[PDB]
Write a protein that binds this ligand. Structure first.
Ligand SMILES: NCC(=O)NS(=O)(=O)OC[C@H]1O[C@@H](n2cnc3c(N)ncnc32)[C@H](O)[C@@H]1O
Length: 441
């Protein structure tokens, strides 16, 4: 089968052969978008093009974009290690039409790449599609132009409980380009639990969301109002790791060549032997987001972007502790990561030494309190009555030991214990009040 690198290249080659300008992945950190924490989609760097404020010499483009979804509008941090399909860091394969072609040709390009004997040659019978309920045009295209049996065409409305809140209406954020979208799913088969989209078991890993095709139509305002974009446009987005799993005949993202090799490296540096333990998958994911974020300029801190990075690093170190790592390990994974990322890791390779040092320092810094904090947490959980850790304890771990509340929640979740978030926040607010009283005017 094709390697992840070969699949990445083949996608770009396909769209390049179809007249699309190949554009390099943007950084994970925008310089000119105050609404955006980290790059969460291939379309981010073309935001102003969709808005009609930025003109390019090309009207169609294709990219393999590095993304991090660990905060802001799209945040999958808490899914990592619990599903076979969610990462913090991942690559999004995209083609874009800037007032060029529209619905029919977008769908045709995607179907051709996925199912043509000349290309990916996926079995058509295992592919399902969803459309926005009101998008009769998209329904007709799939039914009559492509020829998907009606039983595998699913209409999805505002299923997230609010106007435009839907799996079939894609938004960059609370503001920005958005529109109805159509998605392509692949059935991994009855050896995996789950039902098709729209079904009660839709959240299972059986029917995997592979490719989202967004018909960009509006710019969302802060008030929630939709203002039409000057030209209806196309934003498509396919998870590289997810399509790689399909093409390499495996079911989990973590079973692709890239992750198999990376997980081996994690086992090596932690001294773990059970290659199936979920902590290995968590660490493998976390080194990708952490290393690339640092390569793109993020430094660990207690504020904004730096704190998200700090939180992920510390959670990774914690998982390493659970596996029995006896020495500083996380930075040792940068090399192995560079080795599996191919051309997509060039910015990381360029800054290998710097990234390694940042991660080493951060782990060493956290090690000053990690085991001591875990000891306290164990002590508190041992005598805890009920299914919820009190906010005061969570706050003490935060204030004394440098445990972000989500790191504490992560440890507790593994023992079916919740954290009183309201209590933690009350404790933080109480401390802020003390600070104001002491500092004065
Ligand atoms: N602009 C349009 C758009 O963004 N659309 S989409 O939001 O739906 O993400 C595009 C695709 O990236 C994959 N994907 C999304 N999130 C993750 C994740 N956390 N981990 C792994 N793969 C993911 C998945 O294949 C998804 O269909």
């Amino acid at each position: 089968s094709k390697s992840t690198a070969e699949i990445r290249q083949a996608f770009l080659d396909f769209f390049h052969s179809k007249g699309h300008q190949v554009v390099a992945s943007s950084s994970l950190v925008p310089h000119n978008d105050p609404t955006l924490l980290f790059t969460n989609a291939g379309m981010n760097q073309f935001k102003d093009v969709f808005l009609g404020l930025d003109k390019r010499n090309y009207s169609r483009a294709t990219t393999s974009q590095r993304c991090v979804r660990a905060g802001g509008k799209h945040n999958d941090l808490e899914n990592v290690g619990y599903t076979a399909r969610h990462h913090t860091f991942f690559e999004m394969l995209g083609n874009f039409s800037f007032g060029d072609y529209f619905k029919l040709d977008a769908i045709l390009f995607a179907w051709l790449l996925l199912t043509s004997e000349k290309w990916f040659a996926l079995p058509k019978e295992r592919l399902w599609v969803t459309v926005y309920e009101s998008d009769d045009e998209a329904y007709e295209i799939w039914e009559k132009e492509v020829g998907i049996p009606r039983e595998r065409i699913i209409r999805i409305g505002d299923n997230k409980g609010a106007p435009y809140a839907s799996d079939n209406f894609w938004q960059m954020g609370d503001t920005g380009p958005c529109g109805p979208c159509t998605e392509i799913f692949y059935d991994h088969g009855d050896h995996i639990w789950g039902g098709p989209p729209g079904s009660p078991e839709e959240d299972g890993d059986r029917y995997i969301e592979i490719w989202n095709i967004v018909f960009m139509q509006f710019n969302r305002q802060a008030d929630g109002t939709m203002e039409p974009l000057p030209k209806p446009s196309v934003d498509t987005a396919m998870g590289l790791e997810r399509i790689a799993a399909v093409l390499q005949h495996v079911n989990s993202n973590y079973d692709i060549d890239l992750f198999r090799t990376l997980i081996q490296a994690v086992a090596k540096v932690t001294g773990a032997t059970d290659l199936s333990n979920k902590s290995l998958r968590v660490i493998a994911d976390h080194i990708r987001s952490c290393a690339f974020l640092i390569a793109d300029g993020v430094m660990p801190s207690n504020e904004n972007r730096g704190y998200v990075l700090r939180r992920i690093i510390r959670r990774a170190v914690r998982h390493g502790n659970m596996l029995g790592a006896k020495e500083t390990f996380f930075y040792k994974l940068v090399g192995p990561l560079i080795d599996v990322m191919g051309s997509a890791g060039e910015d990381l390779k360029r800054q290998q030494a710097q990234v390694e040092q940042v991660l080493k320092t951060e782990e060493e810094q956290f090690a000053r309190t990690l085991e001591r904090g875990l000891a306290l947490l164990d002590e508190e959980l041992a005598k805890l009555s009920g299914d919820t850790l009190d906010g005061e304890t969570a706050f003490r771990l935060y204030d004394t030991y440098g445990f972000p509340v989500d790191l504490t929640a992560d440890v507790c979740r593994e023992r079916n214990i919740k954290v009183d978030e309201a209590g933690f926040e009350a404790a933080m607010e109480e401390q802020r009040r003390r600070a104001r009283e002491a500092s004065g005017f």
